[PDB]
Each structure stands twice: as structure tokens, then as C-alpha cells.
Design a binder for this molecule. Structure first.
Ligand SMILES: O=C(NCCCc1ccccc1)c1ccc(NC(=O)n2cc3ccccc3c2)cc1
Ligand SMILES: O=C(NCCCc1ccccc1)c1ccc(NC(=O)n2cc3ccccc3c2)cc1
Lengths: 464, 464
């Protein structure tokens, strides 16, 4: 990895565009205008990409040669980068202040700030904008996943009277559906801020290396079938596949995809009749989890529950909701996103089915179908020092008032009612709102403040 | 990187679920039936993750320890992995056959096939499904980018009579808007299959290392301003920022973001009057590229052109379309996706403005706002050998006929009309069509067939 080649190309030309005699460039990150966001992911970026000796003679030379051909010109600031290498032994003279990881902050508040610590490195602040703006992705995955936890908590509390097993109700199925291996690890780790169920193995090593947990692993999985392990038995031997799989995993929970040919027939005749004796004998700690994987997600879930409820002994819980026996559960792992999750739990509640009966598996909806536009994550310059005089800087486009940026030195404070407020124009210097809630997390190539994954989970907890 | 930890967790349990005495598991990838797809990206995956000694004693031990905690059970095929390490020195006994990279294939056709070459490694075929299915991402970026090239080619030919500069009309602005650094490189490389303009530097090193070009670089950029380089001058000094930037880049093309405060005022009064003398003196090889960055993308583009057309000498080309002078161009780099690109070029054509006047910059729309659902990229088992007898396997869900998978051994052929056909059930073995268009690209840990980035671009060319 070469930080000199980890920026948008046009940033290579910006050192020539700032007003002459600029000694300071101060910039901030916010999720402009999903009313609250989970701040997570910055620590990964600081450790993997920004800390220590990030500049070498070889990296300067590599970047010089690439930019010469990429621009068909020599616009690359070799002098500026050589200065960092000679003066600071390749350590970035940058200071980053951030809100603690796991923090749940309303939209339109400063989340982190970046500024150069050496007047010669005024151009460095916005050079690293590209790498830091990528924090949008673990922030959005964590926020969207927590918003799904809120829906699940509401319906589970309503239909069961408690939140037992909440942290296992939304399972990450997204490994194949993401754009890369690196995205998988980052995305799966952000989902693990709110839940404990994951199949995206990549997320576990990321948490271990960059955050750390008291427990040996932050996430868990159960054995489960795929279409290939059922279909390989042949069209006429689906019962044999099912029987073999539940016998191989007789003492542990097992998920079995049952829609290869006909989900309703598999539920009513195979599980419901032919193999029913192998299901009713299972332990409460080792249920059979039936998995539909096609059709309308809500209509399929309701029909599968109606079928199972007629083949198996259904009880009525203390809230008046139907509950499958403890050796039998369902997982809907096709077409699950925040909108369909909501339609399914509401549809289940209307048909008097307890949310304790179901878990959700989400792939693309959880980790891929997200953009920087969802929370409007933006990095903007708000303060500059030119000729020793500080000026409050901002954009305010005529056709888009929502794109107006904050002015001057920023500070995050607790209001008297215990809410959050961002103070602009260095007004935080007046001691009217107490202490700034951002902490120096990076200074001159060193990570100065870190959070464990346990702290992050605690900060990201629901009020509920 | 550890391939034993680069799969969906549940795949760790599948070796126990296949029918006993299974010696072969044969699977294929297709974009289930954007009528045609660009096949690109597999070569990157084969080289970075699948080739050479991918199994070591340390990797087996690491995976064993992780899976023990992840499952709270010892469900990990240590014996199977130890077999690969001892017999093949950690090289995968897999054979991958694929359509050549850059190939443009209609939906619902086999693109690549995977099968184990050793009977003991029947479970390996679908173990690597997760890593190979991630090919969906460079395939979708390449396909969506080529579809935008088709729209641009149609409107540029209609309004100018040629395709000059077509390869520079859609610029990659997506670095900050993607989920990770790795995604950035893969995504920007897939856009470079169709275009030459990129700011996502990461894509250049990926092409150089995995594909290679005769040219020193596959992509180019121009100097350009950002809001920070303009706003840093102060709200009252936007004209000074503009003047400084165009003077610093007087001899090369320069893009200048002009919507910081009021895009229409910047076009009419700053560029159109105060700085007009610095613009009209510019070379044809060094235009000023005005960049709006907010508002309704089409309304803003049309209003900017109407303003500029009244301040600068406009000509009418041989097709009857208005053309700005050669030292002045526009780039729309906000809210550009395949749908808005289409609305803008159609709206320009309706107002008699040539497409030679404009270029597009696309960020999230180009590299992030894509999912595996767009082309329905899917990996499925189609053939198995159990007890020495081959059987044609497939899924066919009752509620979703579109999810039906192909049966048996597959081959891709040219039809008599020169189209593509996928033959099922080993019917390709009858010599009724020509040669199978799938070639072995990977066999027993070695990459057996490679394509240069030059070949890929030629294969992905538009008919026009
Ligand atoms: O229901 C589940 N968890 C919570 C309840 C479990 C429980 C209840 C009571 C006692 C003990 C345990 C559950 C079900 C299925 C799965 N996994 C699958 O069905 N997979 C993994 C996939 C990954 C990618 C693509 C497809 C996949 C299919 C995981 C967890
Ligand atoms: O119009 C362009 N290229 C094709 C025509 C150029 C031409 C015509 C005639 C003769 C010589 C050359 C062009 C314009 C802007 C840009 N770049 C920007 O505006 N940037 C890069 C960004 C990256 C991230 C975020 C924001 C960005 C802003 C690049 C190329």
C-alpha cells in the first residue's frame, strides 16, 4: 500500500491551488441533514493506512513515475512528500479528533476533524480526504444494521414480552454479494457492532486485529445447507438429503434450505410427515431451522408458518402469539433488507405469529445495497490560516441549501437537555457548553486513543 | 490472506452433507436471464487468491482454532485440507474453464465452470464459490459502464457525426464513494475496460500487476479544483481563486468547480465577464472545463450552457448542433448514473446542444450503486458423480421459475447465426456446434491462460 497513490488524482494538483501563504487547512466529517448514525470504522483506517512510516524514498519515486504518465505532466509534489520523509521519518504531521467509536449521534454533527500540525503540510489535510471519507461505509453498515435491530426489538418485545435472542435475529449472509474481500471484512465487522450472527468469516480477523474482544470471537454461525448439498442427491432424493443432514447435525442447530423444488411440499410432506420423527426428537439447543429462499418473502414466510403450525404442536405464549415447538424454527434469508424485514415482522404480528419463531439472513441488503448518499457522509474544509490570519471557510450552493457546509473551528457538545450540538466559528472556546466531546485519536503518525470492540458495542446499544 | 477463512461459514460444514461416495462436484457461473454482460475480473481473483501454495500447516491450524470458537464445535475438515497440503503442496486440485476476458455475452449463458480434479476434493468446488462469486462486481461495473458508453456513443454520433473523444466522456470520480480500497482498484479497473478517464488511482496498479497494457498507464486525469481549493480563498475572493487556478494550469486542461456559492453568477459574471480574457486566450488542447456540482443535473447543465452560449462565441456544427468554442467545456460530476446520463444527453439534444460540449464524472453511480441482483450473477452446482455415476443436478423453485438452474456438464458455443448458446447435459460432446468457447484458465494451482488488458478492451469494444 502506497498512501501517495491512495487519493483522487485531482488532489495531486491541489497544493498549487490553495491561496499563497496558507499554513493551516482544517476539515471535518459529518453525515449531513436515519436520524442518528453509529460512528464506527475510523480506528481501522488509522491503523491500517495512516499510522507509522507511511512515506519512503521508494513510494515517492513510484508515485512520481505513475503521476508523470497519468497526467502526461510533472504536477506531483515531490518536494512536499520528501519534506515529510526527511523531517518526520515518513510520519504524517496530521492531528485527527473524533467522537468515540460506537457513539450514536444525530445527523448534521461533526464526527471527526483533520488538520495539519506543520505549516509546510497545509496540503496534507485534504490529500487524505479520500481514504477517510471511506469511513462512510462502516458507519452506514453499522447504522442500517442498528436500525434493523430497532425494528426487530420492537416486534420481538411486542410478540414475546422480552428481547431474548435479539442479537442472533439478523444474520450476515453477505460475503458473496459484496464488491471485495476487504469490503467483506469491514462490512461484516460493522454488522457485528449490533449482532452476533455472521457467516462472513473475514469480519472476525478484522475485529481481533484492530479492535479486540474479551470473548475469543465477536460472531457465531451454525451448520447450514446450501442448494448444492441438497440438489447433489438428485431431484427424487430430497428426503434422503434432508435425513442425512439432520442426522449428521443431530446434536447442534442446523439450517436446511427447503425450496430447491417445492418449499410447501418439503414443509408439509417431507419435514411434516416423512421426517417428522427426526425433528420432534431434537433438543431445544439444537433446533431444525427451516430455510425458504425464493418467492415473495412475506407470503412465503406466512405460508411456511401456517403449514408448520398444522403439522407440529403450536403453543400460545403469554402475549397471545403462536409459537412453534422449541426444536423447530424458520430463517428467511432471501430478499431481506430494512424494508422487507419490517413488512415481514408486521405481517407475522397481524397473523399472531411470534417473532421468536424467525431469524433473518441478509446479504446484499445488509452489506452491499448502500451508498454514501444514504447518510450524506461528507468531508469539507471549514477553517484555514493564510498570512497568519484564520478565516471561516464554507460552501453554500445556490441550488442546494442541504449542501451548505459548517464554518470555522468545530466542537461537539452536550446540550443542557443531554442532546448533542456542534458549535461553529470556534464558539466552543467560550466555556458556555462545557467540554468538547471529540478526542485526539491521531497525532503525528501515532494513534493516541483507541477503543475495544466491547466499548463500541456498549456505546451502540439501543435505549430499549 | 487465508483461503480457509475466505468462505461463507456454513461451507465449512458442507463436506458432511454431500451424498456419500461423491467423487466430482461441477458448478457454473452465469448472469441469469442489461441484455449482455462484459466478462471481466476472474483473472485478478485467480492470481491474488487461488494460485500457488494457498494451504500451509499454519493456515490449517489458524482456521481450526477460529472455527472451534465460531461454531462452538469442531466442524472443520482438517483431514481434507491436510490432504491438499500433503498431496499437492497446498495447490488447489481445481479446474476452472472460462469465456475469454472482455467477452460480451448475452444473459443466461455459462461464463465459467469449476470442478475438482481429485475425487477426494469433491467439497472444494463449492468452498471457493464465495471468492469466485465476487467476480459479480467487476462484471457489473464493466457492463454498466459499457451500457453508458452505448448511450454516449449514440448521442455523440447523432449530434456531432463522429465518436471523437468518446473514451474520455465518462470519468471515474468514485474513489471516496466506494466501500474500500480494494473495491476502488477492482471497480476503477472495470470502468477502464470501456473508458480512459479516471481519478481512482488504485485501478492503475491493479491493471499493471494483473493484466498489463502496452501503454505506460491505462487511464488519465486532468488537474481539477475541489470546493476546498476555491472556498479557502474566502467567500469574497472566488474570482481570485479562479484566476489563480487557470493561471497555474494555463497550458493544460483544467476543471474548475464553480458552484461553491452561485454557479449561474460564476458562469455569467466571473468566467463570462471578469475572467473572460483568460479563457478566450486558452489553447484547444488546454480548455477550461466548467464544473457544476449541485442542483437538478439536467436543469443545471442546460442553464449553464445557455449562460455560456450568451457570453462566448458559439458555432453550429455540420449536424445543426451548437458548439462552445474549443477552449471551453463542461463536466457534470454530481448525481450521474446510467438514468441521469440518458436524461442529460436527451435534454441537450432537444435544446440543440452537441454532446461534444460535455463530459460526465460519475462516483457512486459508477462504482458503488450496484448489487449482485442487477445481472443476477449466480454460482450453482449442475453436475455430480456419485458411485461412479454422473447425474445432472439443478434447483427449480416452485415460486420462482427465474431461479431455475442449468443441468449437467455445460459448454458455450457459437450458433449458425453467430450468436451464443449454452449446451446443457454434456450435449456439447456431440460435435453439432463448433468448439466450446470456454478455455481452461486455472488447473491444479496454476493460471493456464491469461489476457492482457489490451485484449480485454478489444473484446469489449462496441459494434458502432
Ligand atoms: O436461525 C438462525 N439463527 C438464530 C437462531 C438459532 C438457534 C436457535 C435456538 C437454539 C440454537 C440456535 C440461523 C439460521 C440459519 C443460519 N445460516 C444459514 O441458513 N446460512 C448461512 C448462509 C450464508 C450465506 C448464504 C446462505 C446461507 C445459509 C444461521 C443462523
Ligand atoms: O472533461 C474532462 N475530460 C474529458 C475532456 C477533457 C479535454 C477536452 C479537450 C482537450 C483536452 C482535454 C474532465 C473534467 C474533469 C475532470 N476531473 C474533475 O473535475 N475532478 C476529478 C474528481 C475526482 C473526485 C471528485 C471530484 C472530481 C473533480 C477530469 C476530466
Amino acid at each position: 500500500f502506497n498512501i501517495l497513490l491512495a487519493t483522487d488524482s485531482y488532489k495531486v494538483t491541489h497544493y498549487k491551488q490553495y491561496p499563497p501563504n496558507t499554513s493551516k487547512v482544517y476539515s471535518y466529517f459529518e453525515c449531513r441533514e436515519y436520524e442518528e448514525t453509529v460512528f464506527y470504522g475510523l480506528q481501522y483506517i488509522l491503523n491500517k493506512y495512516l499510522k507509522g512510516k507511511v512515506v519512503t524514498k521508494e513510494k515517492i519515486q513510484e508515485a512520481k513515475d505513475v503521476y508523470k504518465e497519468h497526467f502526461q505532466d510533472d504536477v506531483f509534489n515531490e518536494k512536499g512528500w520528501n519534506y515529510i520523509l526527511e523531517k518526520y521519518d515518513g510520519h504524517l504531521p496530521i492531528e485527527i479528533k473524533a467522537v468515540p467509536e460506537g457513539f450514536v449521534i444525530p445527523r448534521g454533527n461533526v464526527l471527526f476533524t483533520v488538520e495539519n500540525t506543520d505549516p509546510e503540510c497545509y496540503w496534507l489535510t485534504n490529500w487524505i480526504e479520500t481514504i477517510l471519507v471511506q469511513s462512510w461505509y462502516p458507519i452506514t453498515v453499522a447504522t442500517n444494521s442498528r436500525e434493523q435491530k430497532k425494528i426487530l426489538a420492537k416486534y420481538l418485545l411486542e410478540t414475546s414480552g422480552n428481547l431474548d435472542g435479539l442479537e442472533y435475529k439478523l444474520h450476515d449472509f453477505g460475503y458473496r454479494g459484496v464488491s471485495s474481500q476487504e469490503t467483506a471484512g469491514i462490512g461484516a465487522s460493522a454488522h457485528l457492532v449490533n449482532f452476533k450472527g455472521t457467516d462472513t468469516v473475514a469480519g472476525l480477523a478484522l475485529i481481533k486485529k484492530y479492535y479486540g474482544t474479551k470473548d475469543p470471537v465477536p460472531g457465531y454461525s451454525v451448520p447450514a445447507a446450501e442448494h448444492s448439498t441438497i440438489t447433489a442427491w438428485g431431484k427424487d432424493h430430497e428426503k434422503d438429503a434432508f435425513e442425512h443432514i439432520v442426522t449428521q447435525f443431530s446434536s447442534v442447530p442446523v439450517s436446511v434450505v427447503s425450496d430447491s423444488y417445492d418449499i410447501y411440499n418439503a414443509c408439509e410432506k417431507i419435514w411434516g410427515e416423512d421426517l417428522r420423527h427426526l425433528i420432534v426428537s431434537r433438543s431445544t439447543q439444537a433446533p431444525l431451522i427451516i430455510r425458504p429462499d425464493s418467492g415473495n418473502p412475506l407470503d412465503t414466510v406466512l405460508k411456511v408458518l401456517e403449514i408448520l403450525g398444522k403439522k407440529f404442536p403450536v403453543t400460545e405464549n403469554s402475549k397471545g402469539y403462536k409459537l412453534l415447538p422449541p426444536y423447530l424454527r424458520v430463517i428467511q434469508g432471501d430478499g431481506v433488507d430494512i424494508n422487507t424485514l419490517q413488512e415481514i415482522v408486521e405481517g407475522m404480528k397481524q397473523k399472531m405469529w411470534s417473532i421468536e419463531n424467525i431469524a433473518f439472513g441478509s446479504g446484499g441488503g445488509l452489506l452491499q445495497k448502500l451508498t454514501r448518499d444514504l447518510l450524506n457522509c461528507s468531508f469539507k474544509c471549514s477553517y484555514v490560516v493564510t498570512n497568519g490570519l484564520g478565516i471561516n471557510v464554507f460552501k453554500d450552493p445556490v441550488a442546494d441549501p442541504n449542501k451548505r457546509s459548517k464554518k470555522g473551528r468545530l466542537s461537539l457538545h452536550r446540550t443542557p437537555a443531554g442532546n448533542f450540538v456542534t458549535l461553529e466559528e470556534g464558539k466552543g472556546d467560550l466555556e458556555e457548553y462545557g467540554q468538547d466531546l471529540l478526542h485526539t485519536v491521531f497525532k503525528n503518525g501515532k494513534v493516541t486513543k483507541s477503543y475495544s470492540f466491547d466499548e463500541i458495542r456498549k456505546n451502540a446499544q439501543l435505549n430499549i
